[PDB]
RNA sequence: UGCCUGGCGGCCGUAGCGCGGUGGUCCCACCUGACCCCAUGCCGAACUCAGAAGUGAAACGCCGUAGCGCCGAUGGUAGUGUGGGGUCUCCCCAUGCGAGAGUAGGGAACUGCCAGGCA
RNA sequence: GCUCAACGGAUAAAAGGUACUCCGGGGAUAACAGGCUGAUACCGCCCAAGAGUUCAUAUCGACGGCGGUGUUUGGCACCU
RNA sequence: UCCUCCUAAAGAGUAACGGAGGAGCACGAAGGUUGGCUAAUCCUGGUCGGACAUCAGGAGGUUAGUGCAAUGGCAUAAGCC
RNA sequence: CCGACUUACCAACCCGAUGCAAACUGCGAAUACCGGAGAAUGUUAUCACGGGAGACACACGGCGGGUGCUAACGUCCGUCGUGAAGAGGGAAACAACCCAGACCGCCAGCUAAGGUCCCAAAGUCAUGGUUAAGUGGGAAACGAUGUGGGAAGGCCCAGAC
């Protein structure tokens, strides 16, 4: 049910992702096997709160990238070692 | 505490002529302890498993073998 | 007091303690006491912080200790000059990195664990935090 | 495995002839036939091959697969090899003991001008 | 083809022995020295190696 | 020109293991006999010789199957060269290199020179 | 033909006392004091099982943790 | 005095009264060559015989072995006749 | 006797999950090192032979470590830099830290580290926030309705504190 807005990532790397995570946004990617993977950036406070629901990891979400909507499922996540934060979310194109 | 403090002189092992080097016949390529690099084409194997050139040319390292063993070979180029 | 039996080597190098920890998740239990600081945490500060929380929950519930010292720390005696050999082993410490989940417990209501873990975090040199099992 | 033991019985002898770079005359023997082919030091291409399954060899032979049949193919491989200019080969064994049909296969080929 | 102007803006007192030779390769001698070198993927590799002392008005 | 079988290699698990099926005109394997050439630290079991009655059971090859072995991204993470910085027994910034594990997935090989049988 | 093993092997052949002592040097190196550090020592604090008839903190305070001063036993050898 | 591993910072070398072990030999075959062979450990069955002797099948596969400490190596065996 | 009933027990091998290792490796960088080619730059900076030496007491700082207590202006190594053998400016004063390498002269100009209220040369500069402590201008566990910002949450005009 959750619909999350996201934008494509212009630059990628280490210094180009710690730059994002200091602006209350974290990177994530969508991969679905038969299609080219889509690396996107998306907000933190609007997805850290929504992940608190147990249903975030069980239903088919929706991501709005450049107008179109992609139905995905949360495949994996990386969390900060000692803070209530996120670093990456792996989305599989369900 | 005590009952220690002994060591042996370093034996100066290792690869002496790295890949792509032009060697003369009979020049030591690698000084070994076991057989880590095996003898390939146009190289020998001394009693210490020392790999020496047998005909002058350019050294070349290879990974031939069913067991993925390192072979040192020489091309007379 | 936790300490390995039949270890390969009697004395070990000092080494350094850099990086983030590996066991950062609550897997065996439901509520955990995740470390936030850095520094060695010995074998007596584990038992002293364990009794404090196997007693604050009476005796019911399961308790998991996810660290083990396995690191001998020597100490030169008093009035002994320097050199003349490495000192003898005196205690065992467990190196802690920020992120390690030290203790975890299950079978209790959350507010009881959140108080039991408070009486154990007062016996540990390093800062700690209370973390809860997550879906992943 | 009765064949894996044989194939690893002759590996040391086989892999020395790759290092020496010498043309070898490998030999295969079966309870019914016996083959013999000449293989270049490259090891991937053959030059001369004679065997007891060819209709031009087994037609005048009582029974393929015995000592006098081995001498019939040992003669053949030596004439073909000398016809193309190959004279200095080395004898492979393929794990068979150099005692029976292989010995007559080698002895007959040796007598027909081949040098090994 | 197109030449490139390099000027040194920092001293070479405590630099590593590799950064002192790179200045020799470029040809710079003192602070404020300007040289005009040929543009080339090997010359531009020199600038990147010492791209804290030299300043380029390309 | 195609199919199958045998030998010698390249190649090395995307190539190996397990499970189901299938092949005997030729090749191959099991097989018959052993006084003989030859052998058992006893035994023709292995090696070897003399052949063809039988079979494709075992073995081997071929075909299918993911239950294992194996290969394996993109993104992120760790580390690190150079230059700065911090509350500097540990970290951050700019820039360059960038893993390991794991995920999606791939996958039960490909090929060359000869010699046979069949069409 | 050498445990010339003090193993690049001073002689074939070798132990001590000196507070009765002496010479050339060194703060390159010790005792005293100073200096840096603070393991140890002294002082304080944090959590609170418990003692205190009931009652953790009137008074003490287990198993552990964090510091201060430069008063002890030490570490180093920077000054003489 | 000599040998092996770590400290030694992925070429060589690299110190401390740093952490751990060895040598002052053995062999006339334990060397040369030719021919042949593959181990540890578990399962079942079996007379003395037991958890472990020898025998027969299965798994496993080098987890065995190397005259002697450790490292590297070894199936084409450098291991066993 | 066989074991015939039993045991609130301990428990190897395997199976799933979670950690640790300088003397563990089925993986594995960055750098460094060796070799080849090619521009550009450097008063051959490279090697060989010969005449003359000194030196073999090093110190601190950064990075990788051993020892120590991850204590010492402690001690032993690897690599870089400085002092030794280098003056000038800065850090109040302060061989080693930051900037920078002095042939001589000038009552000329521009900058680096560091600074612009007076001592003492240059902003009592401009815009927007924070601090009420002289914090700035020493120090920890721990304790607290100090204060600014951010994302949410609970109750509430069928009336909340
Ligand atoms: Mg000596
Ligand atoms: Mg002497
Ligand atoms: Mg007297
Ligand atoms: Mg005197
Ligand atoms: Mg002194
Ligand atoms: Mg000293
Ligand atoms: Mg090395
Ligand atoms: Mg190195
Ligand atoms: Mg031997
Ligand atoms: Mg042999
Ligand atoms: Mg031998
Ligand atoms: Mg000296
Ligand atoms: Mg000296
Ligand atoms: Mg020194
Ligand atoms: Mg010093
Ligand atoms: Mg100076
Ligand atoms: Mg001054
Ligand atoms: Mg000058
Ligand atoms: Mg003024
Ligand atoms: Mg103050």
UniProtKB/Swiss-Prot annotation, chain A:
Keywords: Ribonucleoprotein, Ribosomal protein, RNA-binding, rRNA-binding. GO terms for biological process: cytoplasmic translation; negative regulation of translation; response to radiation; ribosomal large subunit assembly; translation. SUPFAM superfamilies: Ribosomal protein L25-like. One of its GO terms (molecular function) is 5S rRNA binding. GO terms for cellular component: cytoplasm; cytosol; cytosolic large ribosomal subunit. Coiled coil: none annotated. Signal peptide: none annotated. Gene3D superfamilies: Ribosomal Protein L25, Chain P (2.40.240.10). CDD domains: Ribosomal_L25_TL5_CTC. Belongs to the bacterial ribosomal protein bL25 family. Part of the 50S ribosomal subunit; part of the 5S rRNA/L5/L18/L25 subcomplex. Contacts the 5S rRNA. This is one of the proteins that binds to the 5S RNA in the ribosome where it forms part of the central protuberance. Binds to the 5S rRNA independently of L5 and L18. Not required for binding of the 5S rRNA/L5/L18 subcomplex to 23S rRNA. This is Large ribosomal subunit protein bL25. It comes from Escherichia coli (strain K12).
UniProtKB/Swiss-Prot annotation, chain B:
GO terms for molecular function: ribosome binding; rRNA binding; structural constituent of ribosome; tRNA binding. Residues 1-12 are annotated as: Disordered. The keyword RNA-binding applies. PROSITE patterns: RIBOSOMAL_L27. GO terms for biological process: assembly of large subunit precursor of preribosome; cytoplasmic translation; cytosolic ribosome assembly; positive regulation of ribosome biogenesis; regulation of cell growth; ribosomal large subunit assembly. Part of the 50S ribosomal subunit. Cross-links to the 23S rRNA. Cross-links to the A and P site tRNAs. This is Large ribosomal subunit protein bL27.
UniProtKB/Swiss-Prot annotation, chain D:
The protein has been shown to contain a phosphoserine, which was required for the protein to bind to 5S rRNA. However, the presence of this phosphoserine is controversial, and it has not been seen by mass spectrometry. Keywords: Phosphoprotein, Ribonucleoprotein, Ribosomal protein, RNA-binding, rRNA-binding. Residues 1-16 are annotated as: Required for binding of the 5S rRNA/L5/L18 complex to the 23S rRNA. GO terms for biological process: cytoplasmic translation. It comes from the Bacteria. One of its GO terms (molecular function) is 5S rRNA binding. The keyword rRNA-binding applies. One of its GO terms (cellular component) is cytosol. SUPFAM superfamilies: Translational machinery components (SSF53137). Gene3D superfamilies: 3.30.420.100. InterPro entries: Ribosomal_uL18_bac-type, Ribosomal_uL18_bac/euk. The keyword rRNA-binding applies. Coiled coil: none annotated. The basic N-terminus is not necessary for binding to 5S rRNA. It is however required for cooperative binding of L5 and L18 to 5S rRNA as well as for binding of the 5S rRNA/L5/L18 complex to the 23S rRNA. Belongs to the universal ribosomal protein uL18 family. This is one of the proteins that mediates the attachment of the 5S rRNA subcomplex onto the large ribosomal subunit where it forms part of the central protuberance. Binds stably to 5S rRNA; increases binding abilities of L5 in a cooperative fashion; both proteins together confer 23S rRNA binding. The 5S rRNA and some of its associated proteins might help stabilize positioning of ribosome-bound tRNAs. Part of the 50S ribosomal subunit; part of the 5S rRNA/L5/L18/L25 subcomplex. Contacts the 5S and 23S rRNAs.
Curated annotation (Swiss-Prot), chain E:
One of its GO terms (molecular function) is structural constituent of ribosome. The keyword Lipoprotein does not apply. One of its GO terms (cellular component) is cytoplasm. It comes from the Bacteria. GO terms for biological process: cytoplasmic translation; ribosomal large subunit assembly. The keyword Ribonucleoprotein applies. This protein is located near the guanosine triphosphatase center of the 50S subunit. HAMAP family: Ribosomal_uL30_B (MF_01371_B). Belongs to the universal ribosomal protein uL30 family. This is Large ribosomal subunit protein uL30. The gene is rpmD.
């Amino acid at each position: 049910m959750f619909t999350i807005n996201a934008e494509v990532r212009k630059e990628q790397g280490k210094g180009a992702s710690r730059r994002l995570r200091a602006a209350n946004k974290f990177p994530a990617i969508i991969y679905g096997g038969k299609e080219a993977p889509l690396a996107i950036e998306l907000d933190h406070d609007k997805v850290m709160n929504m992940q608190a629901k147990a249903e975030f990891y069980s239903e088919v979400l929706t991501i709005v990238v450049d107008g179109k909507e992609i139905k995905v499922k949360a495949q994996d996540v990386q969390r900060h070692p000692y803070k209530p934060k996120l670093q990456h979310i792996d989305f599989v194109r369900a | 505490s005590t009952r220690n403090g002994r060591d042996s002189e370093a034996k100066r092992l290792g690869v002496k002529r790295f890949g792509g080097e032009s060697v003369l016949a009979g020049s030591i390529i690698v000084r070994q302890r076991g057989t880590k690099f095996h003898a390939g084409a146009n190289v020998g194997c001394g009693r210490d498993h020392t790999l020496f050139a047998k005909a002058d040319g350019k050294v070349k390292f290879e990974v031939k073998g069913p067991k993925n063993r390192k072979f040192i070979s020489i091309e007379a180029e | 007091m936790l300490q390995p039996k039949r270890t390969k080597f009697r004395k070990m190098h000092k080494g350094r303690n850099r990086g983030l920890a590996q066991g950062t998740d609550v897997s065996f239990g439901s509520f955990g006491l995740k470390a936030v600081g850095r520094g060695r945490l010995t074998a007596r500060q584990i038992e002293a912080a364990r009794r404090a929380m196997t007693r604050a929950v009476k005796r019911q519930g399961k308790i998991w200790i996810r660290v083990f010292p396995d690191k001998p720390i020597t100490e030169k005696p008093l009035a002994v000059r320097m050199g003349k050999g490495k000192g003898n082993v005196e205690y065992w410490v467990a190196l802690i990195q920020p992120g390690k989940v030290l203790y975890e417990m299950d079978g209790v209501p959350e507010e009881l664990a959140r108080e039991a873990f408070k009486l154990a975090a007062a016996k540990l040199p390093i800062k700690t935090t209370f973390v809860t099992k997550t879906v992943m | 495995d009765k064949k894996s033991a044989r194939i690893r019985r002759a590996t040391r002898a086989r892999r020395k002839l790759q290092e020496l770079g010498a043309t070898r005359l490998v030999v295969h023997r079966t309870p019914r036939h016996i083959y013999a082919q000449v293989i270049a030091p490259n090891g991937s291409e053959v030059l001369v091959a004679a065997s007891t399954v060819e209709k031009a060899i087994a037609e005048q032979l009582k029974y393929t697969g015995n000592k006098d049949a081995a001498a019939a193919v040992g003669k053949a491989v030596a004439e073909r090899a000398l016809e193309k200019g190959i004279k200095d080969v080395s004898f492979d064994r393929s794990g068979f003991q150099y005692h029976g049909r292989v010995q007559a296969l080698a002895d007959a080929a040796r007598e027909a001008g081949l040098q090994f | 083809a197109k030449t490139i102007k390099i000027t040194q803006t920092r001293s070479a007192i405590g630099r590593l022995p590799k950064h002192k030779a790179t200045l020799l390769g470029l040809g710079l001698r003192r602070i404020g020295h300007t040289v005009e070198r040929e543009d080339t993927p090997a010359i531009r590799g020199m600038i990147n190696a010492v791209s804290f002392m030299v300043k380029v008005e390309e």
